[PDB]
Every structure is written in structure tokens, then in C-alpha cells.
Amino acid sequence: EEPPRFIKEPKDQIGVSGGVASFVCQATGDPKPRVTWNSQRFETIEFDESAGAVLRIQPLRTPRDENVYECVAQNSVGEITVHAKLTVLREDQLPSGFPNIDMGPQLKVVERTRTATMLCAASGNPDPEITWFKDFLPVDPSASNGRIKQLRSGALQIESSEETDQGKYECVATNSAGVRYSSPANLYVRVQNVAPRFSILPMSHEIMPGGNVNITCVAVGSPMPYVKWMQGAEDLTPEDDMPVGRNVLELTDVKDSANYTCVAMSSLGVIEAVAQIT
Amino acid sequence: EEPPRFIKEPKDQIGVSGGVASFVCQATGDPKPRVTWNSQRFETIEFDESAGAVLRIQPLRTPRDENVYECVAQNSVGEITVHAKLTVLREDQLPSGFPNIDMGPQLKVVERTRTATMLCAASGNPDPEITWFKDFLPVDPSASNGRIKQLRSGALQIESSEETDQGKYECVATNSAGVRYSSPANLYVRVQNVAPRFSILPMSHEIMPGGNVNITCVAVGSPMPYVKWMQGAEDLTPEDDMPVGRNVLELTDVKDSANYTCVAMSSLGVIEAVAQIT
Numbered sequence: 147e148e149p150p151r152f153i154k155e156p157k158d159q160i161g162v163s164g165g166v167a168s169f170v171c172q173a174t175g176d177p178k179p180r181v182t183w184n185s186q187r188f189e190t191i192e193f194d195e196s197a198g199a200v201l202r203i204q205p206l207r208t209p210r211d212e213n214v215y216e217c218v219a220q221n222s223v224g225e226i227t228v229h230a231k232l233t234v235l236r237e238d239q240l241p242s243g244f245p246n247i248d249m250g251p252q253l254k255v256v257e258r259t260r261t262a263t264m265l266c267a268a269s270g271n272p273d274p275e276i277t278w279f280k281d282f283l284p285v286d287p288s289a290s291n292g293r294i295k296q297l298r299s300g301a302l303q304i305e306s307s308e309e310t311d312q313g314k315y316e317c318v319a320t321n322s323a324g325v326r327y328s329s330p331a332n333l334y335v336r337v338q339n340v341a342p343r344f345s346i347l348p349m350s351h352e353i354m355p356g357g358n359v360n361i362t363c364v365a366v367g368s369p370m371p372y373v374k375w376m377q378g379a380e381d382l383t384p385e386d387d388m389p390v391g392r393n394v395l396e397l398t399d400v401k402d403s404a405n406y407t408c409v410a411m412s413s414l415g416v417i418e419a420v421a422q423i424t
Numbered sequence: 425e426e427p428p429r430f431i432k433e434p435k436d437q438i439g440v441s442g443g444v445a446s447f448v449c450q451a452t453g454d455p456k457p458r459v460t461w462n463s464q465r466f467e468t469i470e471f472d473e474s475a476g477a478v479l480r481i482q483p484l485r486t487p488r489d490e491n492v493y494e495c496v497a498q499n500s501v502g503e504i505t506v507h508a509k510l511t512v513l514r515e516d517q518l519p520s521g522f523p524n525i526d527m528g529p530q531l532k533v534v535e536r537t538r539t540a541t542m543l544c545a546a547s548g549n550p551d552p553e554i555t556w557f558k559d560f561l562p563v564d565p566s567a568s569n570g571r572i573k574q575l576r577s578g579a580l581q582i583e584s585s586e587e588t589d590q591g592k593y594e595c596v597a598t599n600s601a602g603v604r605y606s607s608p609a610n611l612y613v614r615v616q617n618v619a620p621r622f623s624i625l626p627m628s629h630e631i632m633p634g635g636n637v638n639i640t641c642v643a644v645g646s647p648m649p650y651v652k653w654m655q656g657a658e659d660l661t662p663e664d665d666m667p668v669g670r671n672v673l674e675l676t677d678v679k680d681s682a683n684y685t686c687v688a689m690s691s692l693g694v695i696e697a698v699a700q701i702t
């Protein structure tokens with residue numbers, strides 16, 4: 147038995163109409179505490195097995211949202227309260243130094259293990275402090291053990307991208323004038339894990355001496371396989387330029403019968419299919 | 425002015441007929457030395473701006489190849505000689521403990537920056553020492569500053585694969601009985617660097633109320649782009665399963681006119697094309 151205490155408490159906020167405001171609040175204890183905040187535009191997002199909670203108001207409408215909000219915490223021992231004030235202005239009423247997003251993040255795809263750098267440039271007076279959110283919850287780069295870090299520019303740099311880094315990112319600029327949210331941007335993390343297989347097999351043929359036949363080989367997969375030709379030991383396709391996906395063996399003037407082999411190959415496998423001219 | 429001296433000298437060798445034998449020899453000095461070894465099956469391969477040289481005999485034929493070979497080194501100051509003996513046996517005359525390749529390396533494709541591990545398991549008595557060759561020249565893992573290293577198994581592990589790691593690899597087993605070469609294996613290093621573009625554009629249409637039309641979007645590139653649909657702000661394709669390459673928007677019973685947008689997207693770009701139903 148032990149009463150709960152807040153690891154993080156909510157701060158007061160000054161928002162802009164049409165934009166977003168978020169209030170964060172989590173606590174720890176034994177047994178675990180359960181946090182609660184107290185409408186279509188209001189939404190709650192839990193974390194840390196319910197012990198954390200984020201209130202998100204979007205879009206902001208003034209002065210209806212302009213109130214105080216409490217974050218309670220239930221426990222077998224007791225419960226505590228924490229306050230946080232919301233203010234909301236309109237675009238035509240924003241102070242000169244209110245934060246503005248000059249360049250926000252944008253829809254991006256990153257292949258697994260590669261680096262994703264979610265850009266964000268913001269002005270204001272004083273210069274705003276950039277935080278980031280992902281799936282309506284704040285990003286904590288310090289928790290990543292060096293893999294994720296914010297650059298001096300505000301950019302969120304995600305090295306060694308993994309599947310869980312996929313999600314809806316938005317950069318947030320805060321200063322004494324208030325808080326401005328960017329247009330959201332989805333990050334997609336691409337895994338390429340499909341072994342190569344033939345889509346169009348080479349056809350066997352019978353021909354007269356010269357004797358013009360093209361033989362087509364088409365293979366698919368993710369990554370997309372190279373496709374080269376061989377007649378037994380000797381390979382016809384030169385390495386310098388080897389086709390990906392599709393390779394059509396043009397035979398000009400043929401005299402004797404021979405068996406041609408198509409090899410499709412990627413990092414996930416090698417496949418073979420034979421075409422025999424008679 | 426300074427005479428030349430050998431950084432590495434050739435060793436005597438015992439080969440097997442049909443197989444390969446290689447003699448290595450390089451030297452250093454001011455001015456630089458130029459090394460020379462002294463037939464269709466004989467070949468020389470230079471390195472270190474000609475100061476290094478490798479004699480390669482393949483295939484071995486006994487007893488015609490069974491001779492002494494010298495590696496001279498020309499220089500303004502003088503020149504030096506180094507000897508090395510070749511012996512060649514037939515398969516039916518191999519000592520019990522002569523090296524054998526149990527599992528050799530094989531044709532492989534590795535994507536750039538990924539790890540390529542060229543396997544090689546060999547038996548013999550005593551147990552043979554594995555060295556590796558690439559494009560008829562020996563691999564020196566110590567030169568890679570940790571990126572390349574031989575495993576205890578004999579495997580050549582190539583981390584952070586780059587374009588120059590592409591080439592023809594063969595593992596070599598050596599012990600007191602002699603030297604055995606494996607079947608060669610090509611390693612291909614795949615770079616995926618083609619920005620996404622549409623191969624089949626969506627078609628505009630005119631329809632009656634219900635009004636069944638499928639709209640096809642096909643894009644290509646390396647890596648291969650995702651392909652999703654949107655009607656302005658709202659995106660129709662669910663994230664969980666998003667098609668790669670091809671996406672065909674089935675419209676069942678339509679009543680009002682609307683503009684549908686196809687977005688193709690990879691790590692190298694985002695492209696858009698619109699289809700308008702009337």
C-alpha cells in the first residue's frame with residue numbers, strides 16, 4: 147500500500163481557434179493509480195497501463211473551451227487533484243510574437259532501419275520550443291536510448307526506423323505567447339519481406355533454323371528480384387546492367403536446339419524456370 | 425631513391441587437378457616497385473598500383489604445372505627474386521586429410537547496408553585454415569576496420585554492404601596436406617534508387633446513377649511505392665493493409681459526382697493523379 151504521486155503535471159495553455167490543445171498528466175504508486183480528466187471535440191488518450199492520460203481538445207472553439215480542467219488519480223489509499231487553465235484566441239487576435247509554423251512535417255515513407263527526419267521550422271517571439279506528438283501522445287526522445295533525438299532545428303530525427311515508429315506525427319511550438327500545432331503528417335515504415343516468384347514463366351518452343359523467338363521471364367517480390375539468363379554454366383546477361391523484374395531473351399538466328407534457364411533472385415531467395423528450344 | 429622490399433612473399437603450394445592455385449607477391453619502396461611473375465590457364469592480377477601481383481593457375485593440370493615460379497621486382501635502384509613451388513595431385517591420389525569443401529558459398533543478393541555472410545564449411549586433417557578470395561584477389565578483413573570479419577566457422581561476414589563488395593567470392597581451405605578451392609559464388613549488392621512514377625493512370629469517367637465503375641492506379645519504382653486512394657482530405661484505403669504497386673478503387677452504387685485522387689508513395693517521393701467521376 148502506498149499513495150500516488152504525479153511524475154508529470156499539466157501546465158496552463160494558450161491556444162488558437164481551429165488548432166489543438168493537449169494536457170498531459172501521469173502518476174505512479176503501489177498499487178497503480180488510474181488518472182481521469184474532468185463533448186465530440188474532447189478526447190482522452192491513456193498510457194502506462196492507464197496511469198497516464200492526455201486530454202486533447204480539437205478543434206479549439208473560443209470561448210466555450212476557455213475553462214479549468216482537473217486530473218484526478220484514484221487509488222486504494224486516496225486521491226489527488228491537479229489543475230490546468232485553457233485560453234483560446236482567434237487568428238485575428240494573435241499577438242505579434244505568437245508561434246507560427248513556417249515549414250511543418252509531411253507524409254513520409256521510410257524503409258525499415260533507415261533514418262526518418264520529420265522536419266519542423268517555427269518562428270515566434272521569443273523563439274518557440276519544439277515538442278513533438280505521435281498518435282496524440284507526446285514523444286520522449288530521452289526514452290529512446292539515443293535512437294531518437296531532436297535536432298537544433300526542431301527536426302525529429304528517427305534513426306533505425308522500426309515498425310512502431312509508424313504513426314501520425316505533429317510538431318508543436320510553444321512560447322510565452324501560446325501554443326501552435328502543425329498540420330499532421332503520417333510516417334509509414336516499409337518492410338520488404340516477400341520472397342521472389344515468377345509472374346510470367348518462359349515458354350518452350352519448336353522452331354525452324356533461324357528461327358527468331360523472344361523468350362519472356364517476369365518475376366516479382368519485395369524487394370523486387372533481378373532477372374538474368376543462362377544456358378547451363380554460361381550466363382548471358384552482363385552484370386553491369388542486369389534487369390530488375392523483367393528480362394526478355396531475344397534470339398535472332400538459331401541453328402541447334404538448346405535449353406535456356408531464367409534465374410530470378412533477391413535477398414530473400416533464388417528461383418529458376420527453364421525454356422527449351424527444339 | 426630506395427631499393428624495394430617484399431611486404432608479402434609467396435608460399436609453396438600443393439594443389440588438386442581441376443582446382444585452383446594462387447601465388448601472392450607484393451613489395452614497397454621509393455620509387456614504387458613493379459612486380460612480375462615468371463599459357464591460357466595462367467593469369468596475372470595486379471594490385472596496389474602494379475606493386476602487388478597474383479599468379480592464378482586454373483584449372484590445374486598435373487604434372488605440367490608442377491614447377492617453381494619467381495616473383496621479380498623492378499626498380500631504379502635494383503631488383504630482387506622470390507621463389508615458390510607448385511605441386512598438383514589428382515582426386516584419386518589425395519591424402520586422407522586433404523581439405524574438402526563440405527558447404528561452399530552460393531550466388532547471393534544483398535541490399536545495400538545489409539549484412540552478407542558468405543558461408544564456408546571445410547574438413548581436413550589437420551582442420552584447414554580458411555582464407556577468402558574476391559575477383560581473383562585475396563580478402564584482407566583486417567583492412568576493413570571492423571566492417572568485414574571472418575567468423576570462427578570460416579564464414580566471411582560483410583556488414584554494411586556497399587557497391588564495391590559486389591564480386592566473385594571463393595573460399596580456400598589450406599592445411600599441411602594442401603589447398604582446396606570452392607565453387608565460386610557471386611555476391612550482388614542491390615541499390616534501390618528509382619523515384620516512384622505511374623505506369624497506369626486512373627481514367628476519368630461519366631456515369632448514370634449507380635453506376636458501377638472500378639478505377640485503376642498502378643505505380644512503379646525502386647523501392648516499389650505504396651498506392652492509396654483519397655477523396656480530398658479523407659483517405660479511403662486503410663493503413664493496416666495498404667497495397668504496394670497496384671490499387672483498384674471499386675465503386676458500387678454512385679449518386680453524386682466526385683473527384684478521387686490516387687497517391688503513390690515511396691521513400692524517394694510522393695506522386696498524385698486524379699480521376700473525376702461525373
Ligand SMILES: *[C@@H]1O[C@H](CO)[C@@H](O)[C@H](O)[C@H]1NC(C)=O
Pocket residue numbers: 358359360396
Ligand atoms: C522480339 O522483340 C524485339 C524488340 O521488341 C523485336 O524487334 C523483334 O521483332 C521480336 N522478335 C520476335 C518476337 O520474334
Ligand SMILES: *[C@@H]1O[C@H](CO)[C@@H](O)[C@H](O)[C@H]1NC(C)=O
Pocket residue numbers: 403404405422
Ligand atoms: C533439355 O533438358 C531436357 C529435360 O531434362 C532434356 O530432355 C533435353 O535433352 C535437354 N535438351 C538440350 C538441347 O539440352
Ligand SMILES: *[C@@H]1O[C@H](CO)[C@@H](O)[C@H](O)[C@H]1NC(C)=O
Pocket residue numbers: 636637638674
Ligand atoms: C470491378 O472489379 C470487381 C472485382 O474483380 C468485379 O467483381 C466487378 O464486377 C468490377 N466492376 C466493374 C468493372 O464495374
Ligand SMILES: *[C@@H]1O[C@H](CO)[C@@H](O)[C@H](O)[C@H]1NC(C)=O
Pocket residue numbers: 681682683700
Ligand atoms: C473536380 O476538379 C475539377 C478540376 O479542378 C473541377 O473543375 C470540378 O469542379 C471538380 N469536381 C468535383 C465534383 O469536385
Ligand SMILES: [Cl-]
Pocket residue numbers: 155156157168169170
Ligand atoms: Cl501539459
Ligand SMILES: [Cl-]
Pocket residue numbers: 274275276298299300
Ligand atoms: Cl527547439
Ligand SMILES: [Cl-]
Pocket residue numbers: 247249250251328329
Ligand atoms: Cl503546417
Ligand SMILES: [Cl-]
Pocket residue numbers: 342343344417
Ligand atoms: Cl515461383
Ligand SMILES: [Cl-]
Pocket residue numbers: 433434435446447448
Ligand atoms: Cl601465397
Ligand SMILES: [Cl-]
Pocket residue numbers: 552553554576577578
Ligand atoms: Cl578458420
Ligand SMILES: [Cl-]
Pocket residue numbers: 525527528529606607
Ligand atoms: Cl563447393
Ligand SMILES: [Cl-]
Pocket residue numbers: 620621622695
Ligand atoms: Cl509519373
